[PDB]
Design a protein around this nucleic acid. Structure first.
Ligand SMILES: [Zn+2]
Lengths: 180, 71, 77, 112, 50, 91, 92
RNA sequence: AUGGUGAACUAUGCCUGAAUAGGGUGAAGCCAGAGGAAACUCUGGUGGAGGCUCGUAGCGGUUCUGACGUGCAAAUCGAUC
RNA sequence: UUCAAAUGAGAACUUUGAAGACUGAAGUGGGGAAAGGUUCCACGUCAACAGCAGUUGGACGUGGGUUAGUCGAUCCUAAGAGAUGGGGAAGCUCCGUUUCAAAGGCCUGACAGGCCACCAUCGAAAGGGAAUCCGGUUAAGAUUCCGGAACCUGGAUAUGGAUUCUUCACGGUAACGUAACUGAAUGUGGAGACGUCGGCGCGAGCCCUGGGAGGAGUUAUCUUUUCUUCUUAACAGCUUAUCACCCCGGAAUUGGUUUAUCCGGAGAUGGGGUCUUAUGGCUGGAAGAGGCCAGCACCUUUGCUGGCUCCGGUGCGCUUGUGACGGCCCGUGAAAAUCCACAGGAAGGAAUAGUUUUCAUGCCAGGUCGUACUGAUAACCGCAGCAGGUCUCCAAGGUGAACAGCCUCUAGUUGAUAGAAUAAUGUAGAUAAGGGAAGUCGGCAAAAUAGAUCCGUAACUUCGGGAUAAGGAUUGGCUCUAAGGGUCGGACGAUCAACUUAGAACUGGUACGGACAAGGGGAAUCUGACUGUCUAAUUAAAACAUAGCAUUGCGAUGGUCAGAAAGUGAUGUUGACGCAAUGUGAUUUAUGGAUUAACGAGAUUCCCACUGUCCCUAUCUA
RNA sequence: GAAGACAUUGUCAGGUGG
C-alpha cells in the first residue's frame, strides 16, 4: 500500500447533495497501485470556505478528462454523474453504490462490474437492485450510486503465461502468493 | 605547535571540553590582551580538547609566548 | 573575479573606500602574427569581488599609474 | 591513465554522489562532484514546459532576482502562454452567456 | 567506523590511558603486593565490546 | 513481409505455454498495443498504458476504457440505453 | 605501430587471424546507418539544388530506405538514368 | 511448569539505495518490389521484443565419492555441473 | 629468489644498491561503508609474540598526531515503532496515534468584538537536502591548516542606480526581454517528486597521434627513431542547442522526417525570430601558481637567476553523464520538510521631495560532534597474525568478441622456515608402439571435435523450433587489385581518412584458430510440461511451486483470522472480473483416463570416432 | 441518520464437540 493514492470514495451527503446539486470537475485519470480498476482525481468547490476541495472517485468507463459532473439529487441522468437512487426509474445501470447513505460505497466497485436497478418502493422509500453475483437486495433511496460500469471490463480474459507476472501482481496487494 | 606559531602567528591551548570557540576567543582576549582572527578546535583522543587560535596581523606570537612563559 | 571594459567605470572602484590594496601584472604575449608586446593587468582588491583590467598599451599604463591616488598601496607582479 | 578517488565519504554510485572528472593545473586528475539537474517548471493546466524561466534548484531560486523566475504578463511564472489564452476567452464567452441566461430568465418571468 | 559518537571517543580515552604499565616508583612502597598491572590490555588480544 | 503463417504477433514467447493460450493472448495483444480513434481529434494516435487508460497525444486528452480496448460492447449498449432513457425520463 | 600499419595496408586480416563473428567485427546496423545517413543527406543536398524535385525526392526516400540501392555510386547512376527518364517522359 | 532473553548467521514480507561484459537466433510494426479482380499473398531489407540461448564476473554446491580430513577449514581446496 | 656494502658480536630473513621474477588494472594498486580502536609517525629496545631465526615488526616502553560557515550527522518524512487523551486490565503495564478532548495564537481596534484548524514527537552518516576550488604544507591528517580566490544563509543600515509631479518601469505583433521596478491575510500551481531495457545524437575524461620546442636512452649495424613533459579549477561576465514556442502565408502532382514512421488546415514544408544554458567556446580566475629544462652559487640558514610551458586530427574506440525517441507490464514504477511564483489586492506611500533593501556596492557573525589509520591469503568476524567471509568507486596498451586467458607500463609486494640430496610409493600434471572398451556391475575418469567463413543440415512438431544438428572443404606469411567515405566547386573535379569485405598472384615441414583459451555427436524407451526452489553438516528427484481448468462459500451486523479484555485488531485506502479454500497442473481428446514438439546436473539400451579401461607395463617433470 | 426494550452486556442451565 505504498503507492495507493487514495480510497475510491464518494463525496459526503451535504446540503448541496441533499437539496440540490453541484458541478465538480475531473483533473486527471490515474492507474491505482494494485487495483483492477482506475481512479479519478476530481475536484469540487467547498461551498463553506474558499478553496477547491479534491475528491477521489472511481473511474467509470466512457468518462474523459476535461469533464464536468453535475451531481447531488437534482442532477441530470448522464454517465459519470451520481444520484440517490429514487429519482431514476428502474433499469438505470450504476456502480460503486452505497449500502447505507453516506458510507461512500461498498458495492459494485470492482473492475467491469455494475448493478441493475429493477424496482422501486417509492412510498416508504427504497429501491430494488441486483448484485453482480445476482442476489437481489432492496435498500433505501437516499444512498447513492455512480452511473455506468467500472472501466476496465475484460481485465480477466487475458491469461498470464508465466509466474513472474503473477509475482509482480501479488507483490502489490498482499503476500498471498506462492500458495500451497 | 612551535611550527604553527612560527608559520601563522598562531597559538595552541589545552582546554576544558565543556567550552567552545566563543569562550576561548573571549578568554584569551581577556587574559592575554590580544585580538584574534578565528579559532579552530578538535578533540584529542585522550578526552581533552585543543584549540588552534590565529591572532591577527597586528600582534605577534613569540613576544607573547615569552610573556606567558612557555616557548 | 570580474572584468572591465570602461575606465570611467573603473576609476571609482579605486576610490570606493573598500579598497586598501591593488596591484599590477605584466604579460608577454603575441598578437595574430604581430610582435611580442607586454600586456598590463591592473588588479584591485574589491573585497566581495576582485576587479581586474587588461591593457596592452604601456603609455596608457603610465597614464593610469600616475592618475591613481598616492595613498593607495600597489604592488608589482 | 591516472585513477581517481571520491572526495566525499560516500563510496557509492548514488544519484547524488555523482562524478565528473576534470583535469587541473598541478598535473593530477581529481574527481569533481556535480550536483543534480534542474527541471523545466511546468504548466498547471497544460502539463507543458514554459519558457523564459531559469531551471534552478528550488532554494537556489531565492538568490536570483525577480526577472529570471518570471515573465512580464499575468500568470507569468506558472503558465504556458496558450493555456492562459484558452482560459481567458473561456472566462469571457461564458461571462457573455451569463447575460444570455439573464435575457432568457427575464423574458420568461416577464411572460409570467 | 570513524563517524564515531562522542561517548565512543570518551571510553576510548579511558582505555588508552588505562593501557600503561605500572609506574616503577610504586614497586618500592612498604607492604606492596601489586607487582604487575593485571588489568592491562591490548587491542587485538581482547575486545572491549565497546 | 508476412514472416509466418499462423503464429503471427505473439511469436516472441516461442514454443512455450500452449497454442490454445497463445491464441487468446495474441487476440488481446493486438488489441491493446494498436492505436485507436480519438473522439475529439478523430486521429489514430490514441494509446493505452497502466491498464484501463486510453490517451491521445494529439490534444493531450485521456479516457478510461477496457483493460485491452478503448471501449466495450457493454459500453456501447449502456450508451445506447442511456440515450434512450435520458430522453424518456426528461420528457 | 608497425603491426597497426600493416593492418592499415590490409594485412593480418585473413580467415586464420579471425576469432570473432561478422557482427562483433562490423555490425550490420552500423553499416546500414552509415550508408543510409550518407544517402539521405546526399538526396537533401540534391533537393536544395533542385537537381531532383520534391515528389521524386519523396518517393526515393522510401525506395532508398528499401534496397535496390547498394551504395553511393550506384544511386548516382540511378540519379542519371532518373534524369534521363524524366526528360523522356516530359518530352514524349 | 514459572519468569526472562534472542531475527548481527538463516527463513519470510516491506522500505530505501546499488550491481550484472561479449555473443547466437531474429517477434511485431514498417519500407521497397512482385503476384492477385479483390480480399489478401510471396520475396529483399528494416527494426531489436522474447521469464529464448551460449558465456564470463555474480549466485549455488550436482558430482567425482578426488586433494585434505592427527585439515588452512568445528564444511576448506581444486575439478566438474 | 641471487651478489656486494653498512649496522652490529651474530644475518638464508633487517636497510640500501646491481640483476631476476610476479600481481598485469573485475590487481598483491589507491580510497571508502559496518566493525576495530592508537594499530597511524618517530625514538629506544628484544625476556616474551611474529608456530624457523630476528639487529626487523601491527609486538614492548616513552611520546607526537586527528583542526571545517561549504564533506557528513543535526533537519525531512518513508515502511514503521511510539506518547498525551481515554478506555480495559487484579496488576507489571496494555489497545490506540488524532481519535467519544475546553489540546493551541493571534490581527487590528475601543477589556470588548473578529479569523483561523492542525495535531505531538522519533526513524536514513547510501534516499530529499543552501553554499568551495586550486596550489603548497607535515614524520603522520586535509574539499578542514597556510597563500590566494568565490559562494550560501541570517542580520542591521548608508550610498549608487531605477520609478515618480501620470506614483507601484518601459520595450517587443508575439515567443520574450533589461540592472531593479512595493504589497499582507487567504487561495492555486510549480520544483523537491522518482521505473527497466533497447537503439540514436551530443559533449566530458581516457586511448591512437601529426608538427614544433625541451630532457633521457639504443646506436658494432639500421632506424628524420623509442620513452616522458608541454597542463589550467571553483565562480562570475558574454556567447551558443534539440524538443518545444511565436509572426508570415496556405499545402494534392500529397509533402516533411527518423537508424527505427510518425506528423499536418487543431495550419505542415519553407523564410524570419524567443527561450531553457546540462554541455560547448572566449576572457578574467592565472601564471604570479604548477610543470620541463639549463646555468649558477654552497659543509652553506640553503638558496639565486634564466628560458620554454605551442599549434593541430580522427574514430561505430573504452568508461561515464545528459538529451530526444521507442518498447516494456492485470507490475505504470513514493510522501514530506524547504524554496519560488501566480491570481487575489487589506494598505502604504512623492514634488520639494519620497519610494525602492528580490538590482549593484559597502559592514559584523556563522556555534556542538565525527574527521588519523587498515578495510584484509597479518590490521575486522571466524577461541588465532586461520589457503575461509564481508557491501562499493577509479579500471591504461598489445592480444583478441571480450571485463575470458597470456604479456607489459603507472603503483606495490618480492611475504608463504631454509639447506643437500633423486630410493621406492604417493599427489597434481604428461607421453606411450600394435590392437582399440576385449577390461569393468557400470565408456567411472582420461582422450577425441570445439574457434571464424562457404555449401548443407532429416524425421517429428504445440509449425514457434529442434540446430553450433549431422556432415564435407577452407584458415599462415609477403606484395597487389576492386568496392565501401567526408570537406571544398559549380557532367565531373581538388583536398582530407578510416579499417571492413571480396578477388589474383609469389613463397616455406606442406605446417598455419599453429601457443593460450575452446561443443564430442547420434539411434531408441520411460518420467515430470518448462525458467525456477530446497533436506548447509550423508539424499538437489519421477519431490515442491507455477500459469490453466472446474467446483464450493460470503452482499458488511458479511467471509477468513486474531486478542488478557476493551470505546480492540488484519485482510481493508477492499466489495463478486472481488475475498477465500479446494482437487489438478502446458496441449490434442480431477485416486483423473489414450497422446504429445522443446527442456531437464532426471533413469536405461545401443552406433560412430576416441583413447593405457586392458594385453602390459615403461619413462619423465614439481 | 439507522436501531430501539429486542438487541446487547454481567451471570446461569440443554444438544454438539481433539
Ligand atoms: Zn486527442
Amino acid at each position: 500500500t505504498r503507492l495507493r493514492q487514495g480510497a475510491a470514495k464518494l463525496r459526503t451527503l451535504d446540503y448541496a447533495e441533499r437539496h440540490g446539486y453541484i458541478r465538480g470537475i475531473v483533473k486527471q485519470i490515474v492507474h491505482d497501485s494494485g487495483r483492477g480498476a482506475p481512479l479519478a482525481k476530481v475536484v469540487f468547490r467547498d461551498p463553506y470556505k474558499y478553496r477547491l476541495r479534491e475528491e477521489i472517485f472511481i473511474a467509470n468507463e466512457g468518462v474523459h478528462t476535461g469533464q464536468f459532473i453535475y451531481a447531488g439529487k437534482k442532477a441530470s441522468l448522464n454517465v459519470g454523474n451520481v444520484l440517490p437512487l429514487g429519482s431514476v426509474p428502474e433499469g438505470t445501470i450504476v456502480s460503486n453504490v452505497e449500502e447505507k447513505p453516506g458510507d461512500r460505497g461498498a458495492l459494485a466497485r470492482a473492475s467491469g462490474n455494475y448493478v441493475i436497478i429493477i424496482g422501486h418502493n417509492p412510498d416508504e422509500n427504497k429501491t430494488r437492485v441486483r448484485l453482480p453475483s445476482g442476489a437481489k437486495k432492496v435498500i433505501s433511496s437516499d444512498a447513492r450510486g455512480v452511473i455506468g460500469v467500472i472501466a476496465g471490463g475484460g481485465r480477466v480474459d487475458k491469461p498470464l503465461l508465466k509466474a513472474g507476472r503473477a509475482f509482480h501482481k501479488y507483490r502489490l496487494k498482499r503476500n498471498s502468493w506462492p500458495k500451497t | 605547535a612551535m611550527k604553527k606559531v612560527e608559520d601563522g602567528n598562531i597559538l595552541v591551548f589545552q582546554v576544558s571540553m565543556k567550552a567552545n570557540k566563543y569562550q576561548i576567543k573571549k578568554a584569551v582576549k581577556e587574559l592575554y590582551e590580544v585580538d584574534v582572527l578565528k579559532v579552530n578546535t578538535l578533540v584529542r583522543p585522550n578526552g581533552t580538547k585543543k584549540a588552534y587560535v590565529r591572532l591577527t596581523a597586528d600582534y605577534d606570537a613569540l613576544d607573547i609566548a615569552n610573556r606567558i612563559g612557555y616557548i | 573575479a570580474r572584468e572591465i571594459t570602461d575606465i570611467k567605470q573603473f576609476l571609482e572602484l579605486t576610490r570606493r573606500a573598500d579598497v586598501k590594496t591593488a596591484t599590477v601584472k605584466i604579460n608577454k604575449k603575441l598578437n595574430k602574427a604581430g610582435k611580442p608586446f607586454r600586456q598590463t593587468k591592473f588588479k584591485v582588491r574589491g573585497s566581495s569581488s576582485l576587479y581586474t583590467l587588461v591593457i596592452n598599451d604601456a603609455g596608457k599604463a603610465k597614464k593610469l599609474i600616475q592618475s591613481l591616488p598616492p595613498t593607495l598601496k600597489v604592488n608589482r607582479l | 591513465a591516472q585513477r581517481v578517488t571520491f572526495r566525499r565519504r560516500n563510496p557509492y554510485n548514488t544519484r547524488s554522489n555523482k562524478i565528473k572528472v576534470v583535469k587541473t593545473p598541478g598535473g593530477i586528475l581529481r574527481a569533481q562532484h556535480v550536483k543534480k539537474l534542474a527541471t523545466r517548471p511546468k504548466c498547471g493546466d497544460c502539463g507543458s514546459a514554459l519558457q523564459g524561466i531559469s531551471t534552478l534548484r528550488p532554494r537556489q531560486y531565492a538568490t536570483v532576482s525577480k526577472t529570471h523566475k518570471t515573465v512580464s504578463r499575468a500568470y507569468g511564472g506558472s503558465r504556458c502562454a496558450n493555456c492562459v489564452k484558452e482560459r481567458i476567452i473561456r472566462a469571457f464567452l461564458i461571462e457573455e452567456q451569463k447575460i444570455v441566461k439573464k435575457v432568457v430568465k427575464e423574458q420568461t418571468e416577464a411572460a409570467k | 567506523a570513524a563517524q564515531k559518537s562522542f561517548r565512543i571517543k570518551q571510553k576510548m580515552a579511558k582505555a588508552k590511558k588505562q593501557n600503561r604499565p605500572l609506574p616503577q616508583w610504586i614497586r618500592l612502597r612498604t607492604n606492596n603486593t601489586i607487582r604487575y598491572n593485571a588489568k592491562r590490555r591490548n587491542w587485538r588480544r581482547t575486545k572491549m565490546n565497546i | 513481409a508476412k514472416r509466418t503463417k499462423k503464429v503471427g504477433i505473439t511469436g516472441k514467447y516461442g514454443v512455450r505455454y500452449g497454442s490454445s493460450l497463445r491464441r487468446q493472448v495474441k487476440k488481446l495483444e493486438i488489441q491493446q498495443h494498436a492505436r485507436y480513434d480519438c473522439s475529439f481529434c478523430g486521429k489514430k494516435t490514441v494509446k493505452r498504458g497502466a491498464a484501463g487508460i486510453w490517451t491521445c497525444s494529439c490534444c493531450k486528452k485521456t479516457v478510461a476504457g477496457g483493460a485491452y480496448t478503448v471501449s466495450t460492447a457493454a459500453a456501447a449498449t449502456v450508451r445506447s440505453t442511456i440515450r434512450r432513457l435520458r430522453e424518456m425520463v426528461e420528457a | 605501430r608497425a603491426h597497426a600499419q600493416s593492418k592499415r595496408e590490409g594485412r593480418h586480416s585473413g580467415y586464420g587471424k579471425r576469432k570473432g563473428t561478422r557482427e562483433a567485427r562490423l555490425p550490420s546496423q552500423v553499416v546500414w546507418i552509415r550508408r543510409l545517413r550518407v544517402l539521405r543527406r546526399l538526396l537533401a543536398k540534391y533537393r536544395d539544388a533542385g537537381k531532383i524535385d520534391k515528389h521524386l525526392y519523396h518517393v526515393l526516400y522510401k525506395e532508398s530506405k528499401g534496397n535496390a540501392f547498394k551504395h553511393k555510386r550506384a544511386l548516382v547512376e540511378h540519379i542519371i538514368q532518373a534524369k534521363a527518364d524524366a526528360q523522356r517522359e516530359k518530352a514524349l
